[PDB]
């Protein structure tokens, strides 16, 4: 009586149940694991807070309306302030982590709409100015708020044009990245497990984000007659196999 459909994920002191899942994606078919010695470089023993950092943090909720263009969060940024995960983050020189991402959106059998939930490794954004204008730090570190693709261009911020993925590629091809759809008629959640993907064994958690999670409405939300025209979307994310190394004074970052 197991269905692909019902699932439970327990991680730390927190549990999620979905009764309307559509399997789960594990990026590149690899599950998060700690850093092996053969791959290690820094000689420091690392710190593995385990259950105090590897639990589920639910970010603040978004509201899908008929005019929504899509939202974008960066990792580990989105979690920069969650509990002890965040403290560890500002206090060590280097850290590394994988995540379980669970995006939630329920409706009824009269609604229609379909969101794309995708994880993009190394999502370098484009400046809407063109040329070689850079995208300032603050703009690519929105924190739990994430970036709202239907917000206005700002100065020093990225471009927010959806048919171009914020980088000069077409929305249609985002499907080459680990992703899952939430089609109100099928699905009510999306779950993706992200292994740590980098060109170095461990890195800085503040100067470099290693994935952007993106939720994009593709088939517009259509509510039943005289229904309220909107649904909330909630994102809950859990660091998994986290390791921190090179402890010290506590980083100070712009803004």
């Amino acid at each position: 009586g197991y269905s692909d459909r019902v699932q439970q994920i327990t991680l730390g002191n927190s549990t999620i149940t979905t009764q309307e899942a559509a399997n789960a994606v594990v990026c590149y078919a690899e599950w998060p694991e700690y850093l092996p010695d053969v791959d290690a470089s820094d000689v420091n023993k690392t710190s593995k807070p385990d259950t105090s950092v590897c639990r589920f943090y639910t970010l603040d909720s978004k509201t899908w309306t008929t005019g929504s263009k899509g939202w974008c969060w960066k990792l580990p940024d989105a979690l920069k302030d969650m509990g002890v995960f965040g403290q560890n983050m500002f206090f060590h020189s280097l850290g590394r982590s994988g995540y379980t991402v669970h995006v939630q959106c329920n409706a009824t059998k009269f609604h229609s709409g379909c969101l794309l939930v995708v994880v993009i490794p190394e999502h370098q954004l484009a400046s809407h100015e063109g040329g070689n204008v850079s995208v300032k730090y603050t703009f690519t570190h929105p924190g739990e708020r994430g970036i709202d693709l239907s917000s206005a261009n700002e100065v020093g911020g990225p471009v927010k044009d959806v048919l171009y993925n914020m980088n000069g590629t077409l929305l249609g091809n985002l499907l080459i990245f680990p992703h899952q759809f939430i089609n109100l008629r099928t699905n009510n959640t999306a779950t993706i497990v992200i292994p740590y993907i980098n060109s170095v064994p461990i890195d800085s958690m503040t100067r470099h984000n290693n994935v952007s999670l993106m939720v994009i409405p593709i088939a517009p939300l259509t509510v039943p007659t005289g229904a309220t025209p909107s649904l909330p979307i909630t994102v809950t994310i859990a660091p998994m196999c986290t390791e921190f190394s090179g402890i010290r004074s506590k980083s100070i970052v712009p803004q």
């Binding site: 269905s3 399997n23 789960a24 994606v25 594990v26 078919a29 680990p178 099928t186 779950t191 497990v193």
Partner: protein, 40 residues
């Protein structure tokens, strides 16, 4: 025959002949069998 000492100096590599699209085409956690229902 390599005439040179360093590995960078050798010619192109030879075909992976690796080929396994499943990391890209089927990264699902619970295995899906073709023919069985997608969602049970």
């Amino acid at each position: 025959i390599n005439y040179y000492k360093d590995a960078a100096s050798t010619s192109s590599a030879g075909q992976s002949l690796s080929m396994d699209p499943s990391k890209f085409t089927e990264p699902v956690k619970d295995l899906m069998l073709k023919g069985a229902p997608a969602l049970n």
